[PDB]
Design a protein around this ligand. Structure first.
Ligand SMILES: Nc1ncnc2c1ncn2[C@@H]1O[C@H](COP(=O)(O)OP(=O)(O)NP(=O)(O)O)[C@@H](O)[C@H]1O
Ligand SMILES: C[S@](=N)(=O)CC[C@H](N)C(=O)O
Ligand SMILES: [Mg+2]
Ligand SMILES: [Mg+2]
Ligand SMILES: [Mg+2]
Lengths: 204, 225
């Protein structure tokens, strides 16, 4: 796809060229639209050892080549476009990089006409910024699961994110308060494993 | 009086409160009991089970038979009923009676037989009146001896673990029920004389006062109803 043109059409001023390292940490470069055509072809350069990839400070740059199909305009900040990328090293996909590793397993399965599809249930708590306590001091009862009150007390946060998932086309279909005080869950349609994995990473 | 007084002199405080802390063992006041002739013989000393005489077992029969009413006297406070039938403590046992039963050298019953020639009534707590307690126990025991009361079968089990394994009568669960049992117990009420009715009146007044006190647990668990 032509990322530069899309940038102009949709008014995207910067792209996050992003990859996930072995420990799950999102690593990214923020690049102005003027540079995206070059980056999309050649990739964004990083010093691999500085991320969780098990490399050496002495190693050549890894190059994170973005997947144009993964593009997401941040719904809370649409001037920014997020892209998932495959880490390349020495001209080849880098096998220590999580997304590349998944793509390899998928390719084997696909060669046997078996395509994994999955959905994820990414439960999370909403807590105080300092992490001392849950965000809602009124959420105290012993069985809080699906609590209507506590759910609606965080309606604004939950509804906002859900509506983003509606617009992104993920097919969200339910949200609730989960079984621990302070805990929530927002569900969306399963998809091809790579799509879900990308969405999983963006979702968090 | 001595313990409280000396504790104070050391800048400390002593309490005989039955259950001062919800999660810890409470204050008992077990009484070891024996009956003697004027000539100096222990009537409980015998050839029956565990070195006890039929007189001892008939006395025990009185204790068992009158246990419900007896509980009012020797467990005389609202708080007493948080020591009896208490949930397990941090130390692993409450060590207090739950049921109207007896064992051998076994601390999980209302009555323990600690050694030949005596009974241990483990029922009373630190609030028990030093005079009404022996008086109430004696009245019950004498009646057991006069009627040749059968204490029933000795239970050599841990009643905290295996209370379910057997059919046993529970002790009164609160002061008001224990007091009702006192009032309905002729032997006990008559043995204590006018003290029994006077005691019952006071304890009912305390209950009416207590039952209207709002507790933190209620607020915490009911505010969001
Ligand atoms: N054929 C399928 N293959 C893979 N995933 C699917 C398939 N069908 C449905 N799903 C997904 O499975 C997920 C269901 O999660 P959820 O609605 O939370 O159900 P649950 O797991 O029974 N809830 P919970 O009590 O939290 O464990 C959704 O993401 C669905 O889209
Ligand atoms: C059995 S023990 N170790 O003597 C304890 C008795 C306990 N304090 C009680 O409430 O009787
Ligand atoms: Mg779920
Ligand atoms: Mg769940
Ligand atoms: Mg003792």
């Amino acid at each position: 796809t032509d990322l530069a043109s899309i940038a102009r059409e949709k008014g995207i001023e910067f792209f996050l060229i992003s990859f996930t390292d072995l420990l799950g940490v999102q690593r990214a470069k923020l690049v102005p639209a003027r540079a995206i055509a070059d980056m999309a072809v050649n990739g964004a350069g990083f010093a691999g050892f500085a991320a969780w990839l098990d490399m050496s400070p002495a190693d050549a740059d890894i190059l994170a080549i973005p997947d144009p199909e993964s593009l997401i305009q941040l719904p809370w900040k649409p001037s920014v476009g997020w892209l998932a990328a495959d880490v390349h090293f020495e001209g080849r996909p880098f096998p220590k990089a999580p997304r590349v590793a998944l793509k390899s397993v998928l390719a084997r399965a696909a060669g046997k006409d078996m395509h994994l599809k999955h959905g994820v249930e990414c439960e999370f708590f909403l807590i105080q910024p300092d992490g001392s306590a849950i965000s809602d001091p009124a959420d105290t009862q012993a069985k809080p699961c699906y609590d209507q009150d506590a759910l609606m007390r965080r309606f604004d946060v939950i509804a906002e994110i859900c509506s983003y998932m509606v617009d992104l086309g993920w097919g969200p279909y339910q949200n609730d308060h989960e079984d621990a005080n302070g805990q929530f869950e927002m569900n969306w349609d399963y998809a091809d494993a790579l799509v879900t994995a990308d969405r999983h990473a963006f979702f968090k | 009086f001595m313990v409280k007084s000396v504790a104070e002199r050391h800048g400390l405080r002593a309490t005989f409160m039955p259950k001062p802390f919800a999660h810890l063992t409470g204050n008992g006041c077990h009484t070891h009991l024996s009956m003697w002739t004027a000539a100096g013989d222990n009537l409980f000393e015998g050839d029956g089970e565990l070195g006890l005489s039929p007189t001892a077992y008939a006395f025990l029969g009185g204790l068992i038979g009158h246990a419900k009413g007896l509980t009012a006297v020797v467990n005389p406070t609202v708080n007493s009923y948080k020591r009896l039938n208490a949930p397990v403590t941090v130390s692993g046992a409450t060590w207090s009676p739950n049921t109207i039963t007896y064992g051998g050298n076994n601390r999980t019953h209302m009555v323990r037989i600690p050694d030949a020639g005596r009974l241990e009534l483990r029922l009373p707590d630190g609030a028990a009146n030093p005079y009404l307690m022996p008086a109430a126990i004696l009245a019950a025991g004498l009646d057991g001896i006069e009627t040749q009361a059968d204490p029933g079968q000795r239970l050599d089990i841990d009643m905290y673990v295996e209370g379910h394994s057997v059919e046993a009568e529970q002790l009164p669960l609160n002061l008001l029920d224990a007091v009702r049992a006192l009032e309905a117990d002729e032997v006990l009420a008559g043995g204590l004389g006018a003290a029994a009715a006077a005691f019952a009146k006071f304890k009912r007044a305390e209950w009416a006062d207590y039952k209207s006190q709002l507790t933190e647990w209620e607020r915490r668990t009911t505010l969001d109803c």
